[PDB]
């Protein structure tokens, strides 16, 4: 029923910028929360980022604080993930989830996407 | 983003004769209890300098506004000269009166 | 609380216009020959948060 | 009473003296698209004095993350809107009060 | 704490006859007050009757005399509507609430219930 479909990543030298964007579609919307999500290979999902729909309940990573930018386009149903100065650790393979954080209940990832993979070196990919 | 708007007939200007110290005490209690803020007052004419005589005055209401709101710190307003048109020191600043 | 503008040239410039707290209640006098005193403001943190 | 409106937005004093009359809206105030145009609070600090009003809409900490701004984790607006589906059981549906 | 259950409800053809029972559970009584109350779609709720615990100063809707009859029974903490002659405008939908009717100070409807639907037609539901 629903789809999320990323795009924007790649590789770049440490201390670069980059632009994850993913968009979603089969979503009654009424309090969609999108967050952007890291798996470092051996290792679990870490919360990269989230944000609702205009409830702007946003969150960051502690050791992130600057480093990424979240933002919306409720009219293309999108979110967008710039990021600058990426350090070597941000190498990472980067999902989006679609949810509903309803602030009397909790929040659930309700659907996971494809993703994309971030490559912080001196070489590229 | 305001809710009460609400006028009425004045009761500051009350003032007796023209060359007194100080002429005309006037006092105002405020009471906010219950979402209701209660204003008492009551004016003495009475002439001296370092006021609050030792006399005895039974304040009556003027008003009970329906407000609803907190309220814990509170100011003073006063209408102040502007002193760039007057007499006295005008350069560019303001200059106040004796109350 | 003081409102004298007037002094000998030395120091000039006195008035009092704090912010003060309301606490249970507040009264209040004045003694002017004049109408410096106009009014009042209350609230909790006035600036545009309440 | 307790509960989210008699703490939270609403309050009678325990001497209250007066009526409460409350009557069923859903003809003038749910719409098949769902009417979000009504809101209420859902988290406050304390309990509301009497015939208290609160608009204010700043930021809620929830849990122990200081979020001085929007950015945050259990930080969250202190509204909510009322889904008002028509389709809402009357328990849910809205009502229009006058006291 | 509490809960009001409805049963009795569905579709009968016009001049029939149905019966509605709404229980209810969670009441330390006293001056428990159960109503019930018609949504027709396209407009608000509409009084239809009500009944207190043994007080019987019954309420009915000025168009709805004689069709419907109330009943209570205690015991099993319950309340019935015996619905005849159905014309056809009582296709709608009833809920059963409960309160307290007080002589001195008045009533309120604490709380509702799950609700049934009723169709007056020609073919069934």
């Known amino acids: 029923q629903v789809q999320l479909v990323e795009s924007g990543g790649g590789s770049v030298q440490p201390g670069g910028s980059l632009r994850l964007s993913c968009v979603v579609s089969?979503?009654?919307?009424?309090?969609?929360?999108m967050g952007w999500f890291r798996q470092v290979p051996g290792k679990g999902l870490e919360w990269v980022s989230g944000?609702?729909?205009?409830?702007?309940?946003?969150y960051y990573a502690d050791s992130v604080k600057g480093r990424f930018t979240i933002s919306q386009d409720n009219a293309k149903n999108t979110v967008y993930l710039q990021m600058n100065s990426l350090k070597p650790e941000d190498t990472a393979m980067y999902y989006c989830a679609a949810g509903s954080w309803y602030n009397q209940w909790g929040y659930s990832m309700d659907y996971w996407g494809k993703g994309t993979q971030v490559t912080v070196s001196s070489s590229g990919q | 983003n305001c809710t009460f708007e609400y006028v009425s007939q004045p009761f500051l200007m009350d003032l007796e004769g023209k060359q007194g110290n100080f002429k005309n005490l006037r006092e105002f209690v405020f009471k906010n209890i219950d979402g209701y803020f209660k204003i008492y007052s009551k004016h003495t004419p009475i002439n001296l300098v370092r006021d609050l005589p030792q006399g005895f005055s039974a304040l009556e209401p003027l008003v009970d506004l329906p407000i609803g709101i907190n309220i814990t710190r509170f100011q003073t307003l006063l209408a102040l000269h502007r002193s760039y048109l007057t007499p006295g020191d005008s350069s560019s600043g303001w200059t106040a009166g004796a109350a | 609380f003081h409102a004298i503008h007037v002094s000998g040239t030395n120091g000039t410039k006195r008035f009092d216009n704090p912010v003060l707290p309301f606490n249970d209640g507040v009264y209040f006098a004045s003694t002017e020959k004049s109408n410096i005193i106009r009014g009042w403001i209350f609230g909790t943190t006035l600036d545009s948060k309440t | 009473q307790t509960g989210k409106i008699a703490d939270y937005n609403y309050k009678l004093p325990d001497d209250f003296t007066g009526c409460v009359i409350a009557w069923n809206s859903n003809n003038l105030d749910s719409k098949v698209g769902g009417n979000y145009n009504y809101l209420y609070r859902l988290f406050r600090k304390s309990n509301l004095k009497p015939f208290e009003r609160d608009i204010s809409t700043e930021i809620y900490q929830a849990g122990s993350t200081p979020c001085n701004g929007v950015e945050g984790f259990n930080c969250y607006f202190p509204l909510q809107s009322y889904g008002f589906q028509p389709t809402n059981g009357v328990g849910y549906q809205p009502y229009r009060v006058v006291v | 704490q509490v809960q009001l259950v409805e049963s009795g409800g569905g579709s009968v053809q016009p001049g029939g006859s149905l019966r509605l029972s709404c229980?209810?559970?969670?009441?330390?009584?006293?001056?428990?007050?159960?109503?019930?109350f018609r949504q027709v779609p396209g407009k608000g709720l509409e009084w239809?009757?009500?009944?207190?615990?043994?007080?019987?100063?019954?309420?009915?809707?000025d168009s709805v005399k004689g069709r419907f009859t109330i009943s209570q029974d205690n015991a099993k903490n319950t309340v019935y509507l015996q619905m005849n002659s159905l014309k056809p405008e009582d296709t709608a939908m009833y809920y059963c609430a409960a309160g307290s009717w007080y002589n001195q100070w008045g009533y309120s409807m604490d709380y509702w219930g799950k609700g049934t639907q009723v169709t007056v037609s020609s073919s069934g539901q």
């Open positions: 089969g979503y009654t919307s009424s309090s969609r929360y």
């Open positions: 944000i609702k729909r205009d409830g702007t309940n946003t």
